[PDB]
Design an enzyme around this catalytic site. Sequence first.
Site, PDB file in Angstrom:
ATOM      1  N   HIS A 201      -1.288 -15.723  47.026  1.00 43.61           N
ATOM      2  CA  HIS A 201      -1.185 -17.164  47.231  1.00 43.61           C
ATOM      3  C   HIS A 201       0.213 -17.600  46.817  1.00 43.61           C
ATOM      4  O   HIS A 201       0.561 -17.561  45.631  1.00 43.61           O
ATOM      5  CB  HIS A 201      -2.290 -17.970  46.506  1.00 43.61           C
ATOM      6  CG  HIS A 201      -2.232 -19.439  46.796  1.00 43.61           C
ATOM      7  ND1 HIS A 201      -2.941 -19.992  47.843  1.00 43.61           N
ATOM      8  CD2 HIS A 201      -1.515 -20.419  46.190  1.00 43.61           C
ATOM      9  CE1 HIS A 201      -2.647 -21.287  47.841  1.00 43.61           C
ATOM     10  NE2 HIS A 201      -1.805 -21.596  46.858  1.00 43.61           N
ATOM     11  N   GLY A 202       1.001 -17.980  47.817  1.00 41.77           N
ATOM     12  CA  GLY A 202       2.366 -18.474  47.652  1.00 41.77           C
ATOM     13  C   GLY A 202       2.395 -19.988  47.640  1.00 41.77           C
ATOM     14  O   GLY A 202       1.599 -20.644  48.329  1.00 41.77           O
ATOM     15  N   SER A 203       3.287 -20.558  46.818  1.00 45.55           N
ATOM     16  CA  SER A 203       3.429 -22.013  46.662  1.00 45.55           C
ATOM     17  C   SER A 203       4.804 -22.334  46.093  1.00 45.55           C
ATOM     18  O   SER A 203       5.427 -21.467  45.478  1.00 45.55           O
ATOM     19  CB  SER A 203       2.348 -22.547  45.722  1.00 45.55           C
ATOM     20  OG  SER A 203       2.100 -23.929  45.915  1.00 45.55           O
ATOM     21  N   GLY A 210       0.818 -27.758  37.841  1.00 50.16           N
ATOM     22  CA  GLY A 210      -0.425 -28.294  38.388  1.00 50.16           C
ATOM     23  C   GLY A 210      -1.462 -27.213  38.624  1.00 50.16           C
ATOM     24  O   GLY A 210      -2.626 -27.408  38.295  1.00 50.16           O
ATOM     25  N   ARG A 217      -6.880 -26.089  44.071  1.00 44.87           N
ATOM     26  CA  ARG A 217      -7.768 -27.167  44.520  1.00 44.87           C
ATOM     27  C   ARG A 217      -7.766 -27.354  46.034  1.00 44.87           C
ATOM     28  O   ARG A 217      -6.807 -26.998  46.712  1.00 44.87           O
ATOM     29  CB  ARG A 217      -7.380 -28.501  43.841  1.00 44.87           C
ATOM     30  CG  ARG A 217      -7.624 -28.572  42.326  1.00 44.87           C
ATOM     31  CD  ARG A 217      -7.120 -29.898  41.740  1.00 44.87           C
ATOM     32  NE  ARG A 217      -5.656 -29.987  41.773  1.00 44.87           N
ATOM     33  CZ  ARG A 217      -4.948 -31.113  41.714  1.00 44.87           C
ATOM     34  NH1 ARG A 217      -5.559 -32.288  41.616  1.00 44.87           N
ATOM     35  NH2 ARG A 217      -3.624 -31.072  41.766  1.00 44.87           N
ATOM     36  N   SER A 243       2.453 -14.858  52.361  1.00 44.88           N
ATOM     37  CA  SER A 243       2.341 -15.806  51.250  1.00 44.88           C
ATOM     38  C   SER A 243       3.725 -16.188  50.688  1.00 44.88           C
ATOM     39  O   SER A 243       3.912 -17.347  50.342  1.00 44.88           O
ATOM     40  CB  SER A 243       1.472 -15.232  50.136  1.00 44.88           C
ATOM     41  OG  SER A 243       0.106 -15.243  50.501  1.00 44.88           O
ATOM     42  N   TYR A 246       5.655 -19.239  51.994  1.00 45.92           N
ATOM     43  CA  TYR A 246       5.191 -20.524  51.475  1.00 45.92           C
ATOM     44  C   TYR A 246       5.829 -20.915  50.122  1.00 45.92           C
ATOM     45  O   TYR A 246       5.553 -22.005  49.629  1.00 45.92           O
ATOM     46  CB  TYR A 246       3.649 -20.583  51.416  1.00 45.92           C
ATOM     47  CG  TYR A 246       3.014 -20.599  52.789  1.00 45.92           C
ATOM     48  CD1 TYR A 246       2.989 -21.761  53.556  1.00 45.92           C
ATOM     49  CD2 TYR A 246       2.450 -19.448  53.330  1.00 45.92           C
ATOM     50  CE1 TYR A 246       2.438 -21.769  54.841  1.00 45.92           C
ATOM     51  CE2 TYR A 246       1.870 -19.450  54.597  1.00 45.92           C
ATOM     52  CZ  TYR A 246       1.867 -20.615  55.352  1.00 45.92           C
ATOM     53  OH  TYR A 246       1.298 -20.619  56.600  1.00 45.92           O
ATOM     54  N   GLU A 327      -5.818 -14.046  57.209  1.00 44.69           N
ATOM     55  CA  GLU A 327      -5.874 -15.108  56.223  1.00 44.69           C
ATOM     56  C   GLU A 327      -7.311 -15.325  55.848  1.00 44.69           C
ATOM     57  O   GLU A 327      -8.205 -15.017  56.644  1.00 44.69           O
ATOM     58  CB  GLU A 327      -5.104 -16.396  56.563  1.00 44.69           C
ATOM     59  CG  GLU A 327      -5.472 -17.095  57.855  1.00 44.69           C
ATOM     60  CD  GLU A 327      -4.481 -18.209  58.141  1.00 44.69           C
ATOM     61  OE1 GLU A 327      -4.878 -19.392  58.054  1.00 44.69           O
ATOM     62  OE2 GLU A 327      -3.297 -17.901  58.417  1.00 44.69           O
TER      63      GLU A 327
HETATM   64  C1  LIG Z   1      -5.425 -31.129  45.806  1.00 48.37           C
HETATM   65  C2  LIG Z   1      -4.237 -30.226  45.882  1.00 48.37           C
HETATM   66  C3  LIG Z   1      -3.303 -29.914  44.943  1.00 48.37           C
HETATM   67  N1  LIG Z   1      -2.375 -29.033  45.435  1.00 48.37           N
HETATM   68  C4  LIG Z   1      -2.673 -28.757  46.677  1.00 48.37           C
HETATM   69  N2  LIG Z   1      -1.989 -27.895  47.569  1.00 48.37           N
HETATM   70  C5  LIG Z   1      -0.566 -27.634  47.283  1.00 48.37           C
HETATM   71  C6  LIG Z   1       0.100 -26.932  48.463  1.00 48.37           C
HETATM   72  N3  LIG Z   1      -0.627 -25.703  48.805  1.00 48.37           N
HETATM   73  C7  LIG Z   1       0.046 -24.938  49.860  1.00 48.37           C
HETATM   74  C8  LIG Z   1      -0.426 -23.494  49.987  1.00 48.37           C
HETATM   75  C9  LIG Z   1       0.497 -22.684  50.885  1.00 48.37           C
HETATM   76  C10 LIG Z   1      -0.085 -21.445  51.473  1.00 48.37           C
HETATM   77  N4  LIG Z   1      -0.642 -21.482  52.678  1.00 48.37           N
HETATM   78  C11 LIG Z   1      -1.159 -20.278  53.166  1.00 48.37           C
HETATM   79  C12 LIG Z   1      -1.757 -20.258  54.430  1.00 48.37           C
HETATM   80 CL1  LIG Z   1      -1.839 -21.728  55.357  1.00 48.37          CL
HETATM   81  C13 LIG Z   1      -2.291 -19.097  54.969  1.00 48.37           C
HETATM   82  C14 LIG Z   1      -2.232 -17.920  54.236  1.00 48.37           C
HETATM   83  C15 LIG Z   1      -1.644 -17.903  52.978  1.00 48.37           C
HETATM   84  C16 LIG Z   1      -1.107 -19.076  52.435  1.00 48.37           C
HETATM   85  C17 LIG Z   1      -0.475 -19.070  51.098  1.00 48.37           C
HETATM   86  O1  LIG Z   1      -0.381 -18.075  50.388  1.00 48.37           O
HETATM   87  N5  LIG Z   1       0.012 -20.284  50.675  1.00 48.37           N
HETATM   88  C18 LIG Z   1      -2.008 -26.044  49.167  1.00 48.37           C
HETATM   89  C19 LIG Z   1      -2.711 -26.686  47.988  1.00 48.37           C
HETATM   90  N6  LIG Z   1      -3.813 -29.460  47.019  1.00 48.37           N
HETATM   91  C20 LIG Z   1      -4.508 -29.455  48.311  1.00 48.37           C
END
Ligand SMILES: Cc1cnc(N2CCN(CCCc3nc4c(Cl)cccc4c(=O)[nH]3)CC2)n1C
Length: 350
Positions: A201-203, A210, A217, A243, A246, A327
Amino acid sequence: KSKLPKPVQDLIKMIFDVESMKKAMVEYEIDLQKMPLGKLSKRQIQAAYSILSEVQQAVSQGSSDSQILDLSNRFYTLIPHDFGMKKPPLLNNADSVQAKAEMLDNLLDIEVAYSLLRGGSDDSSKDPIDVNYEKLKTDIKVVDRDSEEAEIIRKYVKNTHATTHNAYDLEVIDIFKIEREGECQRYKPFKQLHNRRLLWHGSRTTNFAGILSQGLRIAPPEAPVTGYMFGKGIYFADMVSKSANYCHTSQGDPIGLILLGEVALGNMYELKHASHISKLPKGKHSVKGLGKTTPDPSANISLDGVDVPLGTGISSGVNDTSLLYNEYIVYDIAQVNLKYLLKLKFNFKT
Ligand SMILES: Cc1cnc(N2CCN(CCCc3nc4c(Cl)cccc4c(=O)[nH]3)CC2)n1C
């Protein structure tokens, strides 16, 4: 002076950096003179999601650009953007709604980080690194480079970088073992479920205070379901580079953070194309977005009873799919148990 290991202190500084929070907001074209960090609130973000849902309905009803104008303007009134004395760009399509939903998801994590920094006590005799560490309510430990778990993690990074993601290569700087307070107890009904997998999970760096305090979440009920490919769940990949994209790192910020989580997938609902679902079909526990390429299944290994898909990429045999790589999506926050956090160096070849 803090007694925490130097890599842990560097991680805390990185995640609570106020200037990085401001830089992320500028990247989103938010007007910081009208909407500074301190003025951001849950109430305002929720109201902005609700206006995006009104934009989504107007788009699906096939409304004209003149008809959508008032709804588009409403979103900009709630979240002011950097455009001066010019008219802002029209939010008249699906791509616009998705880009703005993604920005609001990020604002929620930025608001949590800032609220932690402002809502406590001030004591000059204590090291601020130790003060900020305690606000995370997470036990963070350094994994020894010469250990077995570090060898397995390095192999997963080394084997799952896709050929289509060749703009950069990855270097593992530090490996942290993480334990969020109460997460183990929350995960207990899913601890013995079948199809438990260790996934990426990349962010962005600005979301990690958070994530550690609140966990991963789902987007709230006010959020537009069509702004998410498989609806409002938590998204993971089995390929490190899918990931890592992202993290949104660049030549001007080449350091990023990535998670390794234990995900209880159970009975998977297998999909090839977009499906903006509100709920899973009866008996299903997750969604598997079928990729054209998959890590080699004969190379699957076990780390503490959890399957690690660290094989090199081979053809899945799946035809006419919209995804190049797999995914995985879960729709209950209790199905995730965060295990590791990696600090990566991105070496750009462009
Ligand atoms: C309430 C709430 C608080 N912070 C969030 N966000 C913050 C942003 N974050 C983005 C996640 C990005 C992501 N996308 C992926 C996808 Cl679309 C496919 C496959 C893998 C991945 C992956 O590793 N990372 C989502 C959660 N939320 C919704």
